Amino acid sequence: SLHKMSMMAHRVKVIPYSTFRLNLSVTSPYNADFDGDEMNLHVPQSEETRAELSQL
Protein backbone atom coordinates (compact mmCIF):
# COMPACT_ATOMS: atom_id res chain seq x y z
CA SER A 1 0.00 0.00 0.00
CA LEU A 2 2.61 2.49 -1.19
CA HIS A 3 0.15 5.18 -2.35
CA LYS A 4 -3.34 6.41 -1.58
CA MET A 5 -4.87 4.68 -4.61
CA SER A 6 -3.88 1.31 -3.11
CA MET A 7 -6.66 1.68 -0.49
CA MET A 8 -10.04 2.63 -1.96
CA ALA A 9 -13.70 2.25 -1.02
CA HIS A 10 -15.88 -0.38 -2.70
CA ARG A 11 -19.55 -1.35 -2.62
CA VAL A 12 -20.18 -4.83 -1.26
CA LYS A 13 -21.68 -7.55 -3.48
CA VAL A 14 -22.40 -10.82 -1.67
CA ILE A 15 -21.47 -13.67 -4.01
CA PRO A 16 -21.18 -17.50 -3.64
CA TYR A 17 -17.48 -18.42 -3.23
CA SER A 18 -14.38 -18.10 -1.03
CA THR A 19 -12.56 -15.35 -2.99
CA PHE A 20 -12.97 -11.60 -3.26
CA ARG A 21 -13.93 -10.43 -6.75
CA LEU A 22 -12.88 -7.11 -8.25
CA ASN A 23 -13.08 -5.43 -11.63
CA LEU A 24 -10.06 -5.86 -13.89
CA SER A 25 -9.65 -2.13 -14.52
CA VAL A 26 -8.92 -1.45 -10.82
CA THR A 27 -5.97 -3.87 -10.63
CA SER A 28 -3.41 -1.30 -11.83
CA PRO A 29 -3.92 1.18 -8.94
CA TYR A 30 -3.71 -1.73 -6.49
CA ASN A 31 -0.69 -3.24 -8.29
CA ALA A 32 -2.38 -6.62 -7.89
CA ASP A 33 -2.89 -9.75 -9.96
CA PHE A 34 -4.63 -13.10 -9.44
CA ASP A 35 -1.65 -15.42 -8.95
CA GLY A 36 -2.50 -15.77 -5.25
CA ASP A 37 -2.48 -12.17 -4.08
CA GLU A 38 -4.48 -11.28 -0.97
CA MET A 39 -6.25 -8.02 -0.15
CA ASN A 40 -7.70 -6.64 3.07
CA LEU A 41 -11.26 -5.42 3.60
CA HIS A 42 -12.36 -3.11 6.42
CA VAL A 43 -15.94 -2.36 7.47
CA PRO A 44 -16.82 1.08 8.91
CA GLN A 45 -18.90 1.06 12.09
CA SER A 46 -20.55 4.50 12.03
CA GLU A 47 -22.65 6.60 9.68
CA GLU A 48 -20.07 9.40 9.68
CA THR A 49 -17.22 7.10 8.64
CA ARG A 50 -19.55 5.39 6.15
CA ALA A 51 -20.37 8.70 4.44
CA GLU A 52 -16.73 9.82 4.55
CA LEU A 53 -15.64 6.53 2.97
CA SER A 54 -18.27 6.78 0.23
CA GLN A 55 -17.62 10.49 -0.48
CA LEU A 56 -13.81 10.71 -0.35
Binding site: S46, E47, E48, T49, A51, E52, S54, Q55, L56
Partner: protein
Protein backbone atom coordinates in the same frame (compact mmCIF):
# COMPACT_ATOMS: atom_id res chain seq x y z
CA UNK B 1 -13.58 37.27 21.23
CA UNK B 2 -10.74 38.59 19.07
CA UNK B 3 -10.47 35.20 17.32
CA UNK B 4 -13.91 35.51 15.65
CA UNK B 5 -13.54 37.32 12.33
CA UNK B 6 -16.59 39.50 11.54
CA UNK B 7 -18.67 38.39 8.57
CA UNK B 8 -17.89 41.62 6.70
CA UNK B 9 -14.19 40.77 6.22
CA UNK B 10 -14.14 37.00 5.68
CA UNK B 11 -11.40 36.10 3.19
CA UNK B 12 -11.77 32.32 2.88
CA UNK B 13 -13.11 30.63 -0.23
CA UNK B 14 -16.92 30.88 -0.57
CA UNK B 15 -17.10 27.33 -1.98
CA UNK B 16 -17.62 24.28 0.22
CA UNK B 17 -14.65 21.92 0.19
CA UNK B 18 -14.80 18.18 -0.42
CA UNK B 19 -13.86 17.44 3.19
CA UNK B 20 -16.47 19.90 4.48
CA UNK B 21 -19.13 18.31 2.27
CA UNK B 22 -18.17 14.82 3.42
CA UNK B 23 -18.28 15.73 7.10
CA UNK B 24 -21.54 17.67 6.73
CA UNK B 25 -23.21 14.74 4.97
CA UNK B 26 -21.89 12.25 7.52
CA UNK B 27 -22.95 14.33 10.52
CA UNK B 28 -26.43 14.97 9.13
CA UNK B 29 -26.82 11.30 8.22
CA UNK B 30 -25.83 10.35 11.77
CA UNK B 31 -28.33 12.82 13.24
CA UNK B 32 -31.11 11.54 10.97
CA UNK B 33 -30.27 7.92 11.83
CA UNK B 34 -30.58 8.97 15.48
CA UNK B 35 -34.15 10.19 14.82
CA UNK B 36 -33.50 13.86 14.07
CA UNK B 37 -36.16 16.19 12.62
CA UNK B 38 -35.92 16.34 8.83
CA UNK B 39 -36.72 19.71 7.26
CA UNK B 40 -37.13 18.39 3.69
CA UNK B 41 -40.10 16.57 2.21
CA UNK B 42 -39.33 12.92 1.45
CA UNK B 43 -40.75 11.33 -1.70
CA UNK B 44 -39.87 7.92 -0.25
CA UNK B 45 -36.45 7.40 1.32
CA UNK B 46 -34.82 5.16 3.91
CA UNK B 47 -31.08 5.91 3.63
CA UNK B 48 -29.97 8.66 6.06
CA UNK B 49 -27.15 9.50 3.65
CA UNK B 50 -29.62 9.99 0.79
CA UNK B 51 -31.83 12.14 3.02
CA UNK B 52 -28.80 14.23 3.98
CA UNK B 53 -27.87 14.60 0.32
CA UNK B 54 -31.37 15.88 -0.42
CA UNK B 55 -31.09 18.34 2.47
CA UNK B 56 -27.73 19.57 1.17
CA UNK B 57 -29.15 19.94 -2.34
CA UNK B 58 -32.05 22.05 -1.07
CA UNK B 59 -29.88 23.96 1.46
CA UNK B 60 -31.80 22.82 4.54
CA UNK B 61 -28.94 21.68 6.81
CA UNK B 62 -28.85 23.80 10.03
CA UNK B 63 -25.08 23.47 10.49
CA UNK B 64 -22.29 26.05 10.34
CA UNK B 65 -18.67 25.20 9.54
CA UNK B 66 -16.06 26.87 11.77
CA UNK B 67 -13.01 27.12 9.53
CA UNK B 68 -9.84 27.46 11.61
CA UNK B 69 -6.75 29.45 10.66
CA UNK B 70 -3.14 28.65 11.63
CA UNK B 71 -3.06 31.55 14.12
CA UNK B 72 -6.07 30.26 16.09
CA UNK B 73 -8.71 32.57 14.61
CA UNK B 74 -11.77 31.16 12.86
CA UNK B 75 -14.54 32.07 10.43
CA UNK B 76 -18.14 30.84 10.61
CA UNK B 77 -19.68 29.84 7.26
CA UNK B 78 -23.26 28.64 6.99
CA UNK B 79 -23.94 25.59 4.84
CA UNK B 80 -26.79 27.47 3.18
CA UNK B 81 -24.48 30.30 2.10
CA UNK B 82 -21.62 27.96 1.11
CA UNK B 83 -21.66 27.17 -2.62
CA UNK B 84 -21.73 23.47 -3.50
CA UNK B 85 -20.21 23.21 -6.99
CA UNK B 86 -17.74 20.31 -6.69
Amino acid sequence: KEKAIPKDQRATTPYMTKYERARILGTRALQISMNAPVFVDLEGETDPLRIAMKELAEKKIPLVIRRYLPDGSFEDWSVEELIVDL
